[PDB]
Design goal:
part of a larger assembly; 2 chains; A: five-stranded mixed sheet; 18 helices; B: mainly beta; four-stranded antiparallel sheet; three-stranded antiparallel sheet; about 35% strand; toxin; pore-forming; insecticidal; chitinases; Chitinase 2
């Protein structure tokens, strides 16, 4: 564990029981040692870790993100003379850089140079960047066992796979794609307690991508007779791309040995098992092996359904036997990959919502409850209690449709956990006004917090108070991308609708790591807006954001400080658990901060990198709520 | 130097002549994923010609891949009798023969009869039973061999 010492002295005659400490002016104090520094004639002790932006002045009953930088005013004028009393200051980014942060990518520079991309730091010549995640550094400190705190998790997805810039590419967005090697986390495993691969699917799904469903169903049905195995209809679960999952070596922390990447949908099927599992999923299995080599086993998991593949949920509803066959395929998958700690479902619309392709009825929620109970039953019928699985679903926070979800009966039917989608509240391309797509906290004037100012706390209170559900059964997290909006006016939150907005790959969805590259910095031990792009924070909702005047472009985003705020709240609550959505694109600094928000403590005096200076607030402002502005 | 036994390179069989003879285009219409698995051949191909056709005649045109020796038989079933909208059809096959002959496989588009064979055609001889070097050698230094 980390350890630190200090000392104090007195005359041989005088022994204070208290830690005597040199009386001095405040100036950029930091750390754990006692400080009684003086400022504005007052005398101030931060009885908590000290940070170079923390200020005792405001600190009199403030000065740390949680409590009073307490004070006395014992100092006399001649003390205020022998020590030149401070009365104001401003911490600056230091001149040096205590730690490297990232490395350039040849191909990303080439990308910017591409005559279609034409990307520029200001985005003037190019609104998108398609920046390779390879730019990133490992960036993970190390931490104590800290067993009591709620579990930590992260989401993971297939977009880890490819960027043909590694192969030259140069003509199309995926040639300018994204991806990273899990070797990263392998370097220091146990970075999380649980993981969730992206929602996969089933035969018969309805959405745009369904040609993939067709192809794989074909491959399966072709293989099945040759394997001497029964054919499958709709509702059977799909692996989507076994070639990615297993027919891989790059980005999956494993030598190219045995990577028969040639194998695919028409041929993988024998390999569709953990023992045989090459590529990504296998790599995960070995990662867990390493993890256990340490101890503290990860809950390896995934789910199915989700934003873009939910379409068949209604269709499968009220087809009980097909639903049975589907969950049969579920448990079969468990048998094929008993490695998994559990897996879950990503139904998203008891009442219709999201993409319209998710056809839906009213009864959907009820039927969903029913089938859910039936699933639970099937699982229990399958599993041995010594190895039991316990299921979770997310929730959308749609104040009404969440009610329509009948969480009460789901709990009564052994659905153990809930993960609140805490992000993208700001449907920036269509939303009426700019807002924080992920605000936990209620801004002032809750009069309009119905399709806006969607403080997750409101739903939280619904479940806790208005539904009695223990926090244990509910989980929350954060995502590693902000929103970006054209022409926004900070006073009115009005903004240029439809106008194309910043993303490396996804317009309107600025990507955290590349934001670290382009717009924000910390190399000088601080939270540092850079390249002329405004660093900013709102007092109304504890909101945090970024701006650029030349295109009135705004970005709402979580931050180290803001996810810290989040984790601290969740921790003070003792929520069921903490996680991060879209974990695929943070260096890990936000994870270190998340540990901090969890109160999860580091285990050594050494660091991968610092984190304290990342919690200075941005340019302070008060932003009126939508209701306040309209009123 | 001296060498080793003859050894099967247990991977994708290698190149041999394509014998391109398509009606409406060059060999470059074709694409071929030559490969192998578990002691048996596997390969996947596509010929980008369908959209050109006057499906009034070219409807249900035989599209696929089939081995043909001097018999030039049609003992295969991967023939995609293309719809007038099969603008980019994928044909996919595997084979299992002990004789590691560099067998010719006619592939692409053909009608069941009549000279009309709208689109790309090729008679690709594959090559199989390939090997690899292992380069180890004497050297001379002055008069003294090493």
């Amino acid at each position: 564990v980390n350890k630190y010492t200090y000392t104090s002295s007195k005359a041989m005659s005088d022994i204070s029981d208290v830690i005597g400490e040199p009386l001095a002016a405040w100036d950029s104090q930091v750390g754990g040692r006692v400080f009684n520094v003086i400022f504005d004639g007052k005398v101030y002790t931060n009885t908590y870790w000290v940070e170079r932006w923390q200020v005792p002045g405001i600190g009199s009953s403030d000065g740390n993100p949680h409590n009073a930088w307490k004070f006395v005013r014992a100092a006399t004028a001649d003390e205020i003379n022998k020590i030149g009393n401070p009365t104001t200051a401003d911490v600056k980014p230091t001149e040096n850089i205590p730690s490297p942060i990232l490395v350039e990518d040849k191909y990303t520079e080439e990308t910017y140079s591409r005559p279609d991309v034409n990307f520029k730091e200001d985005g003037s010549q190019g609104n998108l960047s398609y920046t390779a995640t390879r730019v990133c550094a490992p960036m993970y400190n190390h931490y104590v066992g800290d067993k009591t705190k709620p579990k930590l998790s992260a989401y993971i997805t297939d977009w880890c796979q490819y960027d043909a810039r590694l192969d030259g590419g140069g003509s199309k967005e995926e040639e300018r794609g994204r991806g990273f090697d899990l070797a990263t986390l392998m370097q220091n495993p146990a970075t999380y307690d649980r993981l969730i691969f992206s929602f996969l699917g089933i035969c018969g799904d309805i959405g745009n991508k369904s040609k993939k469903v067709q192809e794989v169903w074909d491959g399966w049905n072709a293989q099945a007779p040759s394997l001497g195995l029964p054919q499958i209809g709709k509702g059977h679960i799909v692996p989507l791309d076994p070639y990615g999952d297993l027919g891989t070596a790059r980005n999956v922390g494993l030598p190219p040995e045995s990577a028969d990447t040639s194998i695919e949908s028409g041929t993988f099927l024998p390999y569709y098992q953990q023992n045989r599992a090459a590529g990504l999923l296998g790599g995960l299995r070995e990662l867990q092996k390493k993890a256990h080599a340490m101890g503290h086993k990860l809950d390896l998991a995934f789910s199915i359904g989700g934003w873009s593949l939910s379409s068949y949920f209604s269709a499968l509803a009220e087809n009980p036997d097909e639903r049975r066959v589907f969950v049969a395929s579920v448990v079969d998958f468990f048998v094929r990959f008993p490695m998994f700690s559990c897996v879950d479902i990503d139904w998203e619309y008891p009442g219709g919502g999201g993409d319209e392709g998710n056809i839906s009825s009213d009864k959907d929620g009820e039927n969903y409850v029913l089938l859910i109970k039936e699933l639970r039953s099937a699982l229990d019928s399958r599993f041995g209690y010594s190895n039991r699985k316990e299921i979770s679903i997310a929730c959308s926070g749609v104040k009404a449709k969440l009610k329509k979800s009948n969480i009460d009966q789901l709990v009564a039917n052994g659905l153990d956990n809930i993960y609140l989608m805490s992000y993208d509240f700001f449907g920036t391309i269509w939303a009426d006004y700019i807002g924080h797509h992920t605000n936990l906290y209620s801004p002032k004037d809750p009069g309009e917090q119905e399709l806006f100012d969607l403080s997750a706390e409101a739903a939280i209170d619904y479940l806790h108070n208005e539904l009695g559900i223990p926090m244990e059964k509910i989980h929350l997290g954060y995502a590693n991308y902000g929103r970006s909006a054209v022409g926004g006016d900070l006073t009115t939150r009005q903004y240029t609708k439809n106008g194309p907005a910043l993303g490396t790959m996804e317009n309107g969805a600025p990507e955290f790591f590349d934001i670290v590259k382009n717009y924000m910095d910390a190399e000088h031990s601080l939270s540092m807006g850079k390249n002329g792009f405004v660093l900013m924070t709102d007092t109304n909702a504890d909101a945090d954001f970024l701006f650029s005047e030349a295109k009135g472009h705004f970005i709402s985003l979580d931050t180290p400080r803001t996810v810290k705020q989040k984790g601290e709240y969740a921790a003070k609550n003792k929520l069921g658990g903490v996680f991060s959505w879209s974990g695929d694109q943070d260096c890990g600094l936000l994870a270190n901060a998340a540990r901090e928000g969890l109160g999860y403590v580091a285990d050594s005096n050494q660091e991968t990198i610092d984190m304290g200076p990342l919690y200075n607030p941005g340019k302070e402002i008060y932003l009126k709520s939508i209701s306040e502005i309209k009123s | 130097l001296i060498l080793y036994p003859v050894i099967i390179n247990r991977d994708w069989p290698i190149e041999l002549d394509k014998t391109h003879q398509g009606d409406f285009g060059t060999v470059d219409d074709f694409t071929l994923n030559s490969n192998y698995t578990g002691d048996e051949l596997s390969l996947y191909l596509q010929s980008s010609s369908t959209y050109k056709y006057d499906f009034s005649k070219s409807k249900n045109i035989i599209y696929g891949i089939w081995k043909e020796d001097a018999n030039n038989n049609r003992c295969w079933l991967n023939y995609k009798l293309l719809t007038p909208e099969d603008y980019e059809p994928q044909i996919n096959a595997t084979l299992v023969m002990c004789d590691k002959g560099d067998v010719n496989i006619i592939t692409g588009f053909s009608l069941p009869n009549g000279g009309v064979d709208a689109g790309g055609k090729i008679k690709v001889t594959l090559r199989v039973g390939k090997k690899l070097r292992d380069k180890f050698q004497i050297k001379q230094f002055s008069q003294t061999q090493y």
